């Protein structure tokens, strides 16, 4: 069967109206815990959630310029911990050049290729980039 070209409908929403894409969070209806998509709440084990759209802007908590990376991935590439105001940390690749990012730098959501799939086609996912 053909491999995925988009990661992932459960974590990333691309509005039907053509509006700006956003990361999706889920709030447990029983305990009120906010987390990324799960079958059951890690805190109370409830299976009832409400989708909460997350901020498109975050801060680079930390990052690393990768010269020897994952097998098959073109190098150099950058990845980071991006902290969102909703008190949720997202791991994501950063768009741009090596030796240009800093800790606590403001970033914005963007869509781009994260890796080649099993059919050697790019998988489109969320990334973060410097704000213009």
């Amino acid at each position: 069967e053909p491999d995925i070209t988009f990661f992932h409908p459960d974590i990333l929403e691309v509005p039907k109206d053509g509006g700006l894409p956003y990361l999706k969070g889920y709030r447990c209806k029983k305990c009120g815990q906010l987390d990324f998509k799960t079958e059951m709440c890690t805190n109370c084990w409830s299976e009832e959630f409400e989708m909460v759209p997350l901020s498109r802007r975050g801060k680079v908590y930390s990052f690393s310029d990768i010269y020897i990376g994952q097998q098959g991935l073109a190098t150099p590439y950058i990845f980071a911990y991006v902290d969102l105001p909703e008190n949720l940390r997202v791991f994501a690749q950063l768009e741009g050049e090596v030796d240009t990012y800093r800790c606590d730098e403001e970033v914005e959501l963007t869509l781009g290729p994260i890796r080649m799939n099993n059919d050697n086609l790019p998988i489109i996912s969320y990334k973060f980039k410097k704000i213009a």
């Binding site: 908590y61 930390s62 010269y67 020897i68 990845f79 940390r89 997202v90 791991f91 890796r115």
Partner: protein
């Protein structure tokens, strides 16, 4: 885990660490036989239980280890243990638990691995996005450099010191003199982690024989090393911002080890830790309470983690000098700590003979967790 009765370490075994052409079973056999001979065990039926740590070699590691020693049988229940890097230490922990509870009076913990003769699925969210372990640790270094003003040269000092510690250690793989410049100038893996700041993949084994106080007397053990404490934890999972210059599981494991043993971090003379990366060691000075929250950099710079300091850290040379056979490192740390307490390390023996020795391994860790597991032992002088 609270010890219901006293547990002591008799003999220890340790193979040379490096690139081996003999498999995990031969290495494990060599380390178990040495530990047994060191316990005045010249026959196969004295040991009542055996636990063996491995990562990727076999589903029946311990059985393949004890097969050539004629020890497999109705008198030797063998259980193999995994928690990535924690495996060799969990093997010793399980042996200690058998003795502490009175299930046995004498048991053995083996850690063995051979990689060179032969990590996460794409479904893991961070792996999907291109995560690599070196990059994960490099983010901890980048954040620490941002918060303390630490440089890549300061990070490099961990490799310099640990290779220096390993110089006269025949068991180590890489040893001797290396300058800060050579470490900093080696191939960049994930900024600021260079090739010389990362532990390598190696082969080796170690074994620890544990027994009751009465068994120490029975075997005629001259220098029994007392198990003051041992703690195993699993790593908390959440997607909230975390202080990555901290270590949730290492902090809670160490504090539980201090509470149970009655021994504080300032009393620790030597320490073997999970130095898979230079930054890991430096962060662990703080996480383990060897120094205050942002003082790890000052602790390193003042020579407090080397000869003549508060605590000689990685006196064997750590993972940065031995390399890292997944199943073996946890056991090997304990075997070396025991020999340092016994004043048996010749050319790399720590100065005032240590009386308190601590060891730490972690292992694994999916997205949302710092590590999947942590195992820490507190060992003390049990003679005099």
């Amino acid at each position: 885990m609270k010890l219901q009765r006293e547990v002591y370490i008799a003999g220890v075994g340790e193979t040379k660490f490096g690139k081996h052409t003999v498999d995990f079973d031969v290495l494990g056999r060599e380390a178990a036989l040495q530990a047994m001979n060191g316990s005045n065990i010249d026959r196969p039926d004295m040991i009542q239980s055996a636990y063996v740590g491995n990562g990727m070699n076999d589903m029946t590691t311990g059985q393949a280890v004890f097969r050539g020693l004629g020890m497999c049988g109705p008198n030797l229940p063998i259980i193999n243990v995994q928690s990535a890097c924690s495996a060799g230490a969990m093997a010793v922990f399980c042996a200690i638990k058998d003795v502490a509870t009175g299930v046995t009076d004498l048991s053995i913990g083996v850690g063995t691995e051979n990689h060179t003769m032969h990590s996460a699925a794409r479904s893991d969210i961070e792996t999907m996005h291109g995560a690599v372990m070196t990059g994960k640790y490099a983010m901890r270094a980048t954040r620490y450099m941002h918060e303390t003003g630490a440089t890549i040269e300061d990070l490099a000092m961990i490799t310099v010191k640990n290779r220096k510690h390993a110089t006269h250690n025949p068991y180590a793989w890489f040893k001797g003199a290396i300058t800060v410049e050579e470490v900093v100038n080696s191939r960049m893996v994930a900024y600021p982690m260079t090739l010389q700041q990362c532990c390598g993949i190696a082969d080796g084994a170690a074994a620890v024989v544990v027994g009751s106080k009465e068994m120490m007397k029975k075997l005629g053990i001259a220098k029994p090393v007392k198990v003051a404490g041992v703690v195993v934890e699993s790593g908390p999972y959440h997607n909230r911002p975390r202080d990555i210059t901290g270590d949730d599981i290492t902090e809670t494991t160490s504090e539980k080890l201090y509470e149970e043993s009655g021994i504080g971090p300032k009393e620790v003379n030597i320490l073997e830790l999970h130095d898979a990366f230079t930054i890991a060691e430096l962060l662990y000075y703080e996480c383990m309470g060897l120094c205050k929250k942002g003082d790890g950099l000052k602790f390193l710079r003042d020579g407090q983690s080397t000869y003549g300091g508060q605590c000689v850290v990685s006196p064997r040379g750590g993972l940065l000098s031995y390399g890292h056979p997944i199943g073996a490192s946890g056991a090997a740390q304990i075997a070396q700590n025991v020999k340092q307490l016994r004043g048996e390390c010749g050319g790399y023996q720590v100065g005032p003979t240590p009386k308190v020795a601590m060891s730490h391994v972690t292992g694994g860790g999916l997205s949302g967790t710092e590590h999947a597991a942590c195992t820490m032992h507190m060992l003390v002088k049990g003679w005099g």
